[PDB]
Design a protein around this ligand. Structure first.
Ligand SMILES: *SCCNC(=O)CCNC(=O)[C@H](O)C(C)(C)COP(=O)(O)OP(=O)(O)OC[C@H]1O[C@@H](n2cnc3c(N)ncnc32)[C@H](O)[C@@H]1OP(=O)(O)O
Ligand SMILES: *SCCNC(=O)CCNC(=O)[C@H](O)C(C)(C)COP(=O)(O)OP(=O)(O)OC[C@H]1O[C@@H](n2cnc3c(N)ncnc32)[C@H](O)[C@@H]1OP(=O)(O)O
Lengths: 305, 326, 325, 288
């Protein structure tokens, strides 16, 4: 025999782990890559083939006549389901911001108002229902348009909170909508699909998930600001969880160090709630890296259900 | 059917899901075990197994929050010169492992993730089967976020002669079945691979006996943990016989490849490449072995829905043995 | 091609023939090694390898006439905490203890004596050649084989330099003309390179050097290599003799060196008596070694068709290490 | 883990070897068995298809012996005459190399067939080669299988008595099995030291009390498994303490007998390992 055979040859075991995982992430199998691309195109099929122009006309057609409700400023049309997740919990799942003027009555007051005035106006044309956050307008063709009720104050517009429900959130809907739209456009329209895929994966977790839809969208903006990887969901989705596992431990901010008021429910920095979220996001990041390294398509399928 | 989805339940909700393949860490045979934990923690997303013996003597220092859950083994493996069927060489002097040392470790263990505590066992401290149930109910604490698992052991201490009687080498399956109603006090039942039978058929038959006994006392969801079994052939066979949790050190000595548990240098030649840097081979084998364990775990979880087509290897053997022993 | 029929010759006549797969016996890891020798002697028709260390301490008693020839290993394996690549885990061994064992050794079959080595008794490469030429006795019915070892003793730190972990291949090639004094050249698997490619190229370097000094039939012995993949690859690279303890821990099956309990499930039967599994594995492994040995001897005539397994891997590596020259 | 893992589980290592090897010998592969039978039928083709009736008539046309032999014929491409299992008749002259040179020319007088002399027997080729062992009368004395200038010191009556009776008792398979054994020993690179007479006597002692299958695939391994032990002691019959065929091997358990025992034992292991591995090429290489 001979002298040698230690696990790390006197190296840092974590440096060896990085060298191995870096070598894995640099080689790819064309067969497994085609299977993964076919998986994501099916999960995003209802989203990329949604009649967005018909959504826009129906929005103008349902708000022309009711002076109280008014369409928002920035065009979203981020409604639409991916991976069979039928939840609306953030700006990435709504089609427009329906702004009412007259606050003190509460978000659920403005929601039911938009609901009632649209259900009477669209009676015999589409069904209207109020949800946990947004009003949904289902039509005969099966199209569901999501409308997020909002109010206008002397301080600006206010969107409902994703968890408190009986209060308005502290987010500036103008800033948020700008970032989500600007990044998505700068992300070849792949940021919003990646966010919905991430929320779909988190939904499959048997564990108790505590992150709101606004905060997940905020985490994605922080993740893909300096993202130089491939513009595919197969590469963008793992980047979100590997970035959010660290970013969720600190209060959310913009580039200059100013609070965006999306992470207040998670307590102070390095709190128990943030640590629990970091481990859940980290286990999903490990499962994604191990499924890709093993070329296991069934493991990627189970992540979405 | 003997194979079923089981696990560890808190308030009727499934906390740990079986069939579960558990990567094990131990200082016995691996003096650099802490370096293995640190490297493999970047790929281990699910539960893993450590030893209270190694926690007490400082062989391992964590952090253990990387895993989904932690199985705290009592330390009877490290406290024993006896080995499992997958040991291929050992140059091991066990130190003292008293009941007080074991109780102090599991008593002070605190973790944000679920914990499974295994009952104490020592090669010189064996009891009759019914008395083993009484010891585990008294030593294992009934605490939040902590499950209780009793590992049955033989009833007789080693004699020291040329041969050893079955009361030393095997557990009393008949006594386990007789006292099977007392298993409601615990969350899981445990038996080592080497001591539940002499060959593969006898181990499968005795596992099936324990499973049928648990299903009669309305413990149809109670997991059976086979300590030491963690390979590409015997582990699926024990699952078809009624077992649920499987751990071992085989992933640290061998390499799983195309349904076979092979020699690592051959795995590096036929899969990793002949020019792979030598300081990366052992960690790459450990990383690939854990991903293989989860793929094999999924095949066992798919057997309940897709049948034998879920297994990618040894399908004729798995079906033949399942027919013969059932 | 780097592969050729070689061996140990007496008066130009072939006494021991290569490629040779050598079943090895050792007390390290096998405390009942004598019990293994007695059982496997009923199936071992060819040569086997034992250790002078075990002869001195009485770990092995024999008789050893069952084998075609006996390779007396010096005892540097048993005297070392260092292990080989196939280990899945020492008393005092002086040069005089080694000289007394090989000095009184008598066998009716041919004997090959290996040069002495100890983890703390290392020398420069040339001094190893001169020490082996002085200690190995020049006797009838006795061949002399020098196992090269690293030139520097272990430092004792966390890392060890290549002068401790590897043999000096460049010094072996430089002093390759001095190999005519011996019958065979020896190198450990772990110490002739860091990975498989480096081990194959360095074996090829030694082979081309031996072929330059007209030692085209002198065997190269890779100590520790005895499996279904690395052994054929070293043979295609220029090696000839292969020994190891893997046949006592693993099981050869369908071109793979596998875990024994799985071999008993897929080949021996799930109900085979447990007291016969360890011996049946050893018996089947020796017959597998002879079948694999025949595949390597058939490569010289039939080419890669002689190999029933890993044909793609064997060709790819063989081309890469021969083009580098 | 658990207490256990001994090599023999506390048994004698040779008892473990016996249990394993017996279980191997009890299961058989029908495909490999047919491959071996096809091998031996070809190796014994020239012997089993020899026109033995024409051999005796051509012998009577040129002339025989008391006991009918006609054991001549080639097996496994071995063209050697070293014992009674390779001769067709004993040509007896009334009164060693002198009787051979005498008989040779006198056969050319009867026909002018080809006549040639060898190291042991005179060969008469027709184009068929008939082997004739010359002898003289003193009982009879036949030439030694070793030195040219000596008599074998054996009673040719006793030897022929057993060789013909045993062969018949072996359904005529003893003489073919001996020739196969001599072919295997001839391929050994080591120096073969057993004479043709001694090998035939070893086979007589080996197949006495043989209850196995009367096939060459099973008889040939039995010879080497028996001769490895019998060659260590001076050769005898049941009630007689000398056949005068193995005296050249020294005393009992001598170095010469031990070297021969080791060669016969290695052939027995190679045959048992070739069958256990179902390796037809290993059986083929045993014959060349
Ligand atoms: S898709 C993968 C490729 N990556 C890309 O982004 C493509 C190329 N695009 C880019 O270069 C960047 O995306 C650019 C366009 C530079 C985006 O940076 P900007 O400088 O344009 O924008 P900022 O995000 O820095 O600031 C704009 C507003 O965004 C709000 N905001 C920042 N961070 C958040 C989070 N986490 N949550 C909510 N809103 C957030 C800020 O409020 C800011 O408004 P201000 O008025 O500036 O405060
Ligand atoms: S191969 C499967 C069949 N073989 C069997 O053994 C089956 C039994 N059936 C038979 O008919 C056998 O042929 C037996 C009964 C064994 C024949 O035994 P014999 O009674 O014929 O044998 P003996 O040795 O007692 O006497 C035979 C005479 O043959 C001569 N002779 C014996 N042994 C030799 C040797 N080794 N070499 C030369 N000649 C030999 C002797 O003349 C002998 O008479 P003795 O009394 O032995 O001198």
């Amino acid at each position: 025999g001979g002298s040698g055979g230690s696990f790390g040859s006197g190296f840092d075991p974590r440096d060896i782990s990085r060298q191995v995982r870096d070598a894995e992430k640099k080689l790819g199998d064309e067969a497994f890559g085609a299977k993964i691309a076919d998986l994501f195109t099916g999960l995003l099929g209802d989203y990329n083939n949604r009649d967005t122009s018909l959504v826009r006309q129906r929005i103008d057609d349902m708000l022309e006549g009711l002076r109280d409700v008014a369409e928002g400023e920035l065009d979203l049309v981020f409604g639409g389901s991916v991976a069979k997740r039928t939840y609306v919990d953030g700006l990435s799942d709504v089609d427009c911001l329906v702004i009412v003027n007259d606050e003190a009555a509460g978000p659920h007051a403005a929601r039911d108002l938009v609901a009632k005035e649209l259900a009477a106006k669209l009676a015999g044309k589409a069904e209207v229902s109020a949800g946990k956050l947004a009003v949904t307008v289902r039509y005969g063709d099966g199209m569901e348009i999501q409308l997020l009720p909002a109010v206008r104050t002397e301080a600006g517009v206010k969107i409902p909170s994703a968890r408190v429900d009986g209060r308005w959130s502290e987010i500036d809907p103008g800033k948020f909508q700008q970032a989500l739209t600007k990044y998505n456009k700068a992300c070849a329209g792949k940021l919003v699909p990646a966010v919905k895929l991430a929320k779909a994966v988190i939904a499959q977790l048997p564990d108790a998930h505590q992150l709101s839809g606004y905060h997940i969208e905020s985490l994605a903006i922080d993740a893909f600001r300096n993202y130089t990887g491939t513009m595919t969901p197969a590469a963008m989705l793992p980047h979100f969880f590997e970035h959010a596992k660290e970013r969720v431990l600190r209060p959310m901010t913009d580039r200059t160090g100013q609070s965006v008021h999306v992470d207040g429910y998670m307590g102070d920095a390095h709190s128990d709630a943030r640590k629990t979220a970091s481990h859940l996001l980290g286990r999903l990041a490990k499962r994604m890296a191990n499924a890709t390294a093993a070329r296991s398509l069934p493991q990627w399928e189970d992540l979405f259900g | 059917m003997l194979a079923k989805r089981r696990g560890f339940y808190l308030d009727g909700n499934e906390i740990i899901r079986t069939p579960l393949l558990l990567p094990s860490f131990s200082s016995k045979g691996f003096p650099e075990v802490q370096e293995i934990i640190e490297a493999t923690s970047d790929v281990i997303d699910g539960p893993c197994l450590i030893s209270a013996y190694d926690l007490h003597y400082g062989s391992i220092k964590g952090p253990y929050d990387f895993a989904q859950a932690i199985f705290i083994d009592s330390g009877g493996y490290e406290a024993s010169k006896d080995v499992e069927l997958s040991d291929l060489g050992t140059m091991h002097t066990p130190a003292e492992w008293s009941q007080d040392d074991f109780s102090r470790i599991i008593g002070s263990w605190q973790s944000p993730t679920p914990t499974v505590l295994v009952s104490y066992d020592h090669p010189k401290d064996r009891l009759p089967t019914r008395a083993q149930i009484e010891r585990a109910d008294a030593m294992l604490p009934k605490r939040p976020h902590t499950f209780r698992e009793i590992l049955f052991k033989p009833e007789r201490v080693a004699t020291g002669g040329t041969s050893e009687p079955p009361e030393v080498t095997r557990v009393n399956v008949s006594a386990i079945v007789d006292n099977i109603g007392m298993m409601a006090r615990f969350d899981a039942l445990g038996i080592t691979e080497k001591e539940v039978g002499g060959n593969l058929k006898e181990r499968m038959v005795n596992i099936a006996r324990i499973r049928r006994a648990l299903d009669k006392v309305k413990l149809t969801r109670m997991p059976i943990h086979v300590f030491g079994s963690l390979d590409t052939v015997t582990t699926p066979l024990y699952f078809l016989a009624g077992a649920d949790v499987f751990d071992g050190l085989t992933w640290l000595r061998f390499a799983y490849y195309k349904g076979m548990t092979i020699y690592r240098q051959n795995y590096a030649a036929v899969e990793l490449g002949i020019d792979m840097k030598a300081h990366l081979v052992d960690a790459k084998c450990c990383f690939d072995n854990y991903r293989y364990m989860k793929g094999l775990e999924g095949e066992m979880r798919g057997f309940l829905k897709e049948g034998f087509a879920s297994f990618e290897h040894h399908r004729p053997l798995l079906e033949r043995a399942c027919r013969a022993v059932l």
